Symmetry: C4
Subunit: 476 residues, 4 copies
C-alpha cells in the first residue's frame, strides 16, 4: 500500500551507519570526504600552530632582550611591574633609555638595527592647576601632546603634577635566521617599541613598561649558499584545498538536511490521512540529524577561518587573533564530530545518549544553583574586596568560587586575608567555611548523583528497547 511505500523508503532514510545504509545497495562515497575533511582541517591547524609558535618564540626572546637593554636596573633574568617613585629617578630612567637607543650598536648583541627616529610623546593636561595644600584644584580636561624627535643628549623639563603620561617610540629591525633558512616563512621583523610611564592614577607611583608590536615582511634580496632564493608558499595552496573539501561537505550535508526535512513534513502530513496524529515535536526533532548541523557549522567556521588565514598571510598584517579563534573552534567541533563514526561500531553510543538525556534535567538544576552562586558571589566581592587579594573585580571572585567548588587553592585563600579588621576577617571565615561546606558536598554531590542516575536509566534503555515512538513502531 501507500503506507508501505513511504515507510519503505523511510526504513533506509534512517539506517544509522552509512555502512549499514549502503549495505542495502551501492552508493558512491560521501563519508570518505568527511574523513578527508578531518585529516585536512587538523593538518591545516597543526601546520598553522607550529609556524605561529615559532614567530611567538622569537618575539618573546626579543622583547626580553629589549626589557634588559632599555630599562635601568632590570635584573638580568626578570623583574616585573617595575615602577619608579622619585622624580629624580624618572629623570635618570629617561636619560638612560634614550642613551641606550643612541648607543645601541655598541651595546646590543642582537642584530637589531634602526629603520631609515625616536618619538618622545608627553601628554599633559591643557590647564593643569593642582594645590593639595589648599584642598582645591582647577583643571580643563583636555590632552595636549608636546612631542620630540631624537636622531642617532637632550634637555627636557617635565612639570610632574601636570603630567598624564610619557612615551618613547622607536622602530628596530631584526632578522631571524633559523626560521628563514630552515623553512619558508617571512623572516623580516619590524619592531615598534613604546616605553610608557603611567602617571594616570596620580598616586606618585610612576609605572613603566615596554610594549612590542611586531610586523612581519619578507627580505627583498636574499641569498642562501651562494645562490638566490624566494620563499614558495605551498600552504597558500593547502588552505585552498581545505576550503574546497569543507565546502563540499557543507553542500552534501545541507542536502542531507533538507531532504530529511521534506521527508519530515512528508511523514507528518501523510500521518493525517490515515491515523490522524501529530507529534509536531517528536518526529520533527527526529528527522533533523543534529550531527549534520554540527558538520555544517564547523564547516562554515573552517571556511571563514581559512579565508582569514589566507588574507592574513598574503596581505600579512599578522594580528592572528580572530583567525585563530575560528580555525580552532572549528577543529574542536570536527574532532567532536568523530564520535558518531566511533558510534557506528555500536559499543560506545552511551556517552552521547546519556549526555543528551542528562542535559534537559541538569539545565534546570544548574539554573537554580546559579541563583545561590550569584547571591554568594556579590557578597564575597564587596565584603571581601577591600582585603582579600583574590576577591577584587567581580570576575576574579567568580574564578575563586569556581576554583573552590573544585577544591583548588584553598589554604591560600584562608591565609591571604589581611586580618586588619577582626570583624571582617572572621566574616570571611564564616563565608568560606559555609560556601565550601555547602556548594561542594551538598550541591555538587547532588549534581553528580543526578548525572549518574540518568546514566542508570539510559543503561536499562540500552538493555530493553527505548521509549516507543509512533515512528519506530511504524518503522519495524
Amino acid at each position: 500500500l501507500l503506507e508501505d511505500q513511504m515507510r519503505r523508503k523511510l526504513k533506509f532514510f534512517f539506517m544509522n551507519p552509512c555502512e549499514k545504509f549502503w549495505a542495502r545497495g551501492r552508493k558512491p562515497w560521501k563519508l570518505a570526504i568527511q574523513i578527508l575533511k578531518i585529516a585536512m582541517v587538523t593538518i591545516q591547524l597543526v601546520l598553522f600552530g607550529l609556524s605561529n609558535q615559532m614567530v611567538v618564540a622569537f618575539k618573546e626572546e626579543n622583547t626580553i632582550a629589549f626589557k634588559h637593554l632599555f630599562l635601568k636596573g632590570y635584573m638580568d633574568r626578570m623583574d616585573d611591574t617595575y615602577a619608579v617613585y622619585t622624580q629624580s629617578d624618572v629623570y635618570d630612567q629617561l636619560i638612560f633609555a634614550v642613551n641606550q637607543y643612541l648607543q645601541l650598536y655598541n651595546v646590543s648583541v642582537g642584530n637589531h638595527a634602526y629603520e631609515n627616529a625616536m618619538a618622545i610623546c608627553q601628554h599633559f593636561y591643557k590647564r593643569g592647576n593642582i594645590y593639595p595644600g589648599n584642598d582645591t584644584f582647577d583643571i580643563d580636561p583636555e590632552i595636549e601632546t608636546e612631542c620630540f624627535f631624537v636622531e642617532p643628549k637632550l634637555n627636557l623639563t617635565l612639570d610632574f603634577h601636570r603630567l598624564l603620561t610619557v612615551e618613547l617610540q622607536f622602530k628596530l629591525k631584526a632578522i631571524n635566521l633559523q626560521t628563514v633558512r630552515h623553512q619558508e616563512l617571512p623572516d623580516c621583523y619590524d619592531f615598534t617599541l613604546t616605553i610608557t610611564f603611567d602617571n594616570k592614577a596620580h598616586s606618585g607611583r610612576i609605572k613603566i613598561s615596554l610594549d612590542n608590536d611586531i610586523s612581519i615582511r619578507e627580505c627583498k634580496d636574499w641569498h642562501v649558499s651562494g645562490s638566490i632564493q624566494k620563499n614558495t608558499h605551498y600552504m597558500m595552496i593547502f588552505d585552498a584545498f581545505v576550503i574546497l573539501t569543507c565546502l563540499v561537505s557543507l553542500i552534501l550535508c545541507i542536502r542531507s538536511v533538507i531532504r530529511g526535512l521534506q521527508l519530515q513534513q512528508e511523514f507528518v502530513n501523510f500521518f493525517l490521512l490515515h491515523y490522524k496524529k501529530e507529534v509536531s515535536v517528536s518526529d520533527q526533532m527526529e528527522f533533523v540529524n543534529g550531527w549534520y548541523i554540527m558538520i555544517i557549522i564547523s564547516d562554515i567556521l573552517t571556511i571563514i577561518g581559512s579565508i582569514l588565514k589566507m588574507e592574513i598571510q598574503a596581505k600579512s598584517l599578522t594580528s592572528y587573533d580572530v583567525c585563530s579563534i575560528l580555525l580552532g573552534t572549528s577543529t574542536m567541533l570536527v574532532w567532536l564530530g568523530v564520535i558518531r563514526y566511533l558510534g557506528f561500531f555500536a559499543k560506545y553510543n552511551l556517552l552521547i545518549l546519556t549526555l543528551q538525556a542528562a542535559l534537559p534535567n541538569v539545565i534546570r538544576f544548574c539554573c537554580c544553583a546559579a541563583m545561590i552562586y550569584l547571591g554568594y558571589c556579590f557578597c564575597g566581592w564587596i565584603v571581601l574586596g577591600p582585603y582579600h587579594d583574590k576577591f577584587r573585580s567581580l570576575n576574579m571572585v567568580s574564578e575563586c568560587l569556581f576554583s573552590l567548588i573544585n577544591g583548588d587553592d584553598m589554604f591560600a585563600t584562608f591565609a591571604k586575608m589581611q586580618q586588619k579588621s577582626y570583624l571582617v576577617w572572621l566574616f570571611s571565615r564564616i563565608y568560606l567555611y559555609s560556601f565550601i561546606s555547602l556548594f561542594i558536598y551538598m550541591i555538587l554531590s547532588l549534581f553528580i548523583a543526578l548525572i549518574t542516575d540518568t546514566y542508570e536509566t539510559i543503561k536499562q534503555y540500552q538493555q530493553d528497547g527505548f521509549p516507543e515512538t509512533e515512528l519506530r513502531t511504524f518503522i519495524s
Copy 2:
C-alpha cells in the same frame, strides 16, 4: 458545611505560585514589588562596590608609594615584614625617614602635601632595669611616652632595653583627579601615617611597618573646564528609594506571616470540634512560610545596611566595615530568595526539597564527626605546633585539616616538617596519613553517600505524591 467553608478559603491560602493563586481571581501586584526589591538591592550593592573599590585602589597605590618613600632599602617593587637588627641600623632608619618627610617636596613624584607636624612618640618603661648577666631584672610596668614635634635634623638618644616602641606620625594630603573629574565622589584624601617600631617581643628583632588611615572629605573650592562644580549625590536619593521598597516588602510579608498564623490556630482549633486531632508540630510548621521569614530578615538587614551607608556617606567617616557586611549578607539572602520564583516553573523544586530533607539527618552525622575532628585538631596543634609552619595557632590547624579534607596543599604539608626531632617528624606522618586516609574516604564518602541517598528518596517522592498530611488529605 462549616468544614467546607474554612477548608475552602484554605485551598487558596496555599496556592504556591502567586500566579496560581491570582489565577482564581484578580489581585493587584505584590510579587512585582519583590522583583523590584531584588533589582534595587543589587543595583545599590553594585553601585556601592564600584565606588568603594576605586577608593581602595587609590589607597593601595599611595601606601605603596609611601613604603618606598619613607622605608630605607625598600626594594623598588616590594619587600615585606622588613626588620632591623642592629641599633646603628635603627638609628640610620629613623634619620632617613625624618629626612624624607622634610625633603618630601624635592623627593616625591606624587602631589602629596603637608597639612597646616611630625609626631615622634617613644614609649619606654617607667623604671626599666634589666641585667641578663646577673639573671635578674627589676621593672615597674608603666608606659611613659616622651614625645617630639618636628617642623618642615635632630638629636635623639634611645636607651634600647628600656624602649617598648617608637612611632612617627605625619599627615599628608593627596588629591585624586580621575575619580573626581570622571564621576561625583569626594576626592580629598587625608592621610595619617604611623611608622611603628615593635620592640615588644624584646628579641633584639626590631620590626618596622607603615600604617595608613585615609579620611575622605570634599574639596571646598573646585573648578572644572574653567567653570565651577559641586558634586551632586544622587545615590543619596537612591539609598532612600531602596529603604522604601524594602520597608514595603517588610510590611506586606509580615501580614502574609501573621495572616497564616491566625489561620494556623484557626485550623488546629477548628480540628478539635470535629476530628479532635492535633499536629501541633506538623501544621504549625506548614503555615509559617519560611521563605517570607527570609524576605523579612534580608529586608531588615537591607534597611539597616542602607541607613548606615547613608550616614557613613553623609557624616563621611568611611570605615565601611559593618555597613559592607550587612548590605552584603542581605543581597546574599535575597538572591537566594529568587529560587522560589524559579520554583513556580516547577522543574527545579528538587534542590530545596532535598536540601531541606537532607539537613535533619546530616546535622546529627556532622555533630558526631565533629567530635573526631576536634580530638584530631588539638593533638595536631600541640604535637605539630613547635615544628610545622602551618599548625601554630589552633585556627590555622582548623584550616589545615579543612584544606586536607578537601585535598588541597598536601605535599606542601608533608614537605614543610622540620625533621629536627625524628620522633615527632615520624609522628606527623602517622598523623597526616591517618587523618587523610580516614576523614577523606571513610567519613567524607559516608557523608556524600548520605546526601545522595536522601536525593533518591525525595526523587521518588516527586514521583509518587508525598508523605500524607491530614491537611493535604483535607485540602484535596
Copy 3:
C-alpha cells in the same frame, strides 16, 4: 528459673545508655567523672599548648636575630641554606662571626649577654693525604679535634682537604619580659649556639648553619613594680588533679571490664548445661566493651603524659617532645571517646556502626591494593630518582604518590622533570599518566564504592533489627 535469673541480671548488664541502666534503679554517678575527665585532660592540654607556644615564639625570634647577627650577608629578611664556595670566603666568614661575638654589645639591639667563652672546634682527619691528580689517596679514618678558646682577633690556619667540619660555640643569655611580667613562667633563657661548617660531603661546597638550644631557668632575684615576686606554679597542682581523675576512671572502667569478663564466661559456661552451644568468638567479643578499652588506654597515656609534663617542668629540661606526643595522643582518643555519649541520644550511631562494619572488608582490599602501590613506588624511586626533584628518598616518593592519589600538586610533577634524558623523561609520563589514571578512578572509586555499599547494608540493619545472636535472642 536459673535461666531467667542469670539472664535477668544480664538484661541490665547491657543497658547501653548509663542513663538507661540507672533508669532501672538509682546508682551514684560514674559518667560524671568521665565528663570531668574530658574537661580536665583538654584544659591541661590547652593550658600547656599556649605556654609552650609562647616559649617557641621567643626562640624563633631570637634565633632569627642571631642568623642576621653572626652570618655575613644574611639578607635582612631571610635567606636559607646559605653556603660558601671559596676558601677566602670561608676565612672572611669566620673572621666576621667571631668579630660579631666580641663586638656583640655595640652591635646587637637585643638584651643578649654573655655567660660568665667562644669554643672553636676543628675536626680534621688524623692522617689526611689526598691527591686527586694522582687518582690516589691515603687516609687513617680517625677524628682529632684541635680546639680554641676565645675571650671577650686571632690567627688561624686550616688545611682544607684535611678538614671534616668546623664549629663555633658560645652561650648567650636573654631575658623575656612580656611572658614573666604578664604570667608566671620561667623567663631566663640560656642559649647555646653552634655555627657549623659541613665539609663532610667534600664537594667543595662548604655548608653553614646556626643551631640554637634553649635551656630555661628562673631569675634568682626578681622585682616587679618596686616589690619582689616569686612565680607560683598552680599548673603543678592542676597536673596532679588530672592524674587523680584519670586514675579513677582507669580503675572504675577496669572493674567494668573484668566484671563483664566474668559474666562472659559465666554466660558461655552456663550455656553448656542447657543448650550446649559455644560462640567462643561472638559473645566473648560482645562482653568486652571496647570503648572501655579506649578509656583505659587514653587514661594510661594521660597519666604518663602528665607525670612527664610534671618532671619536665620541675627538673625543667624542656625537651618536651615525648611528653607532647603522649599528652596529645591521649586527648585525641578521649575526644574520640565522646562519640558514645553522643550515641546515647541514638540519632548518630551510624558512623561507628558502619565504620566498624566497613573495616573487616576494607582491610583485605587495602592490602591487595598496597601490593600494586609498592611495586609502583619502587620503580618510581629508581627510574625517576636521578631527575625528578620529588622522587629522591623512597619516602618522598610515598608522599608523591599519596599526594597524587588525592590529586594535589599534579602539574608541578609533570613540569619538574629534567628533560635531559628523553627516554626517561618519556618514561615518567607513561608512569604518571598510568598511575593517576589507574589508582584514582579505578582503585579509589572501587574503595569508596565499597564503603558506601557497606553503609547501605548497615542502613537497612538500622531499619530491620540486626544479625540475630543467641544472646540477643536470649536477652529479649
Copy 4:
C-alpha cells in the same frame, strides 16, 4: 570413561592455590622459588638505587659548586637560566670563567684537580653576511669551528652576528671520600665541563649554562688506615644469583604455559568426538594462565636489566638510563604479581576480578571521550598558545587538561592569562569554564559510575556463582 579420565586430570590442572593443588598429593616446591624471586629482584633494585643515589648526590653538589665557581654573578644559593644581553658582558663573562679555571687552586675549596687543557670552541657560519638595515642577508649554511687551547690571559675577537655558539671544555678530577671509605664503590670522579653560549635563536639574548658529565673509575693505588685496600664487589655475584632464580622461574612457568596449552587443544579436540561444541575463544582464554605470562615478562626484563647492570658496572660507562628503566619496570610487574598469592587466601579476589571485568567496557568509553579530549586540546593549543604560559607545546596542553580534569592548579590557569587581547582572554574563559564543567562532572562522573556499577555486578557474582562455562559445568 574416557570423559572422566581427561576431566579427572583436568580437575587438578586448575586447582587455583598451589597449596590447594599440592593438597591432592605431594609435589616439591616451585612457589617457594617465586617468593625467592620477589625477595631477590627487590633486594637487587634497592641495593642498586641506594648506590646510584649516592653517586647522584655527589654529582649534584659538585655541579653546583662549579656553577658558582665559573659563572660570574651566580647568586651564592642559586640563580637559574642566567643570560647575558650585552657583548661587553659576554666578553667579561668569558674572561672571568677562564681566569677562574687557571686560578682554580687558589679559588676552590674542593679537591678538584686538573687532568694531565681548556678547549675553547667557537662555531660560526662559513660565510656570514647579515644586514638588517638593508632588510637583506646572504649566508652559506656551514659550520666552521675555530678552536683554542689554554694551558694552566688571552686575546680573542668574536664577530657576534656570525657567531652561532661558544664553548669551554675542561676536565676536572674529584675524589669522594665518604663513599669509598664507608662502602666499596668506585670513588674516582672524572668531570667534563662544557660552558655553552647559545646564540642560536639570534635574539640578542646570549644564553649560558654549565653541563656536567661524570665518568667513574677506580683509584689505582689506595690506602686506608695505614694498610692497602681493593674494593671487593659482591653485588657482582648477587646480580648473577638473581639472573639464575629469574631464569628458573622463566623455564618452570614456560612449561606451566605450554602444558596448559596442549591441555587446551586436548580439551577442545576431545570436545568434538562427544558433544561437538567449540568455545575456540572461552577456553583457549581459560587455559592460558595470564599471570604466568606476567611472571615470564618481568622475568625477561629482570634478566636483561641485570645483565646490563652487570656490564654497566664492569665496563663502567655509568649512563644507567636504559638499565634503570628495565630493572624498575620488572620489579613493578613482580610486586604486582604478588596479588595472586594474596588471592590464595580468597578474601581479596575482588580487585582483579572487577578490574578485569571493568576494562572491556571502559576501553570503549575511554576511546569515545578521547575524541572530545583531542578536539579540545588542539583548540586550546593554538588559540591559547600565544598568551597562556601553560599552553605552549601540544604536550604541556595535555598536562594542563589532565591536571584540570583532576582539579589541580586551577586558579593559577585563570590568573596566568595575559589579558592583552580582550577577545582571546574572554575566549579562554569560555574554554576553561566549559572544559572543566563538562569533562569533570559529566564525563568523569559517568566513568566512575561505570566502574562502580561493574563492581556491583561482580559483587553479586561473588555471591551467586559465576557465568556458567561448559568447562566449569564439566569440571564439577
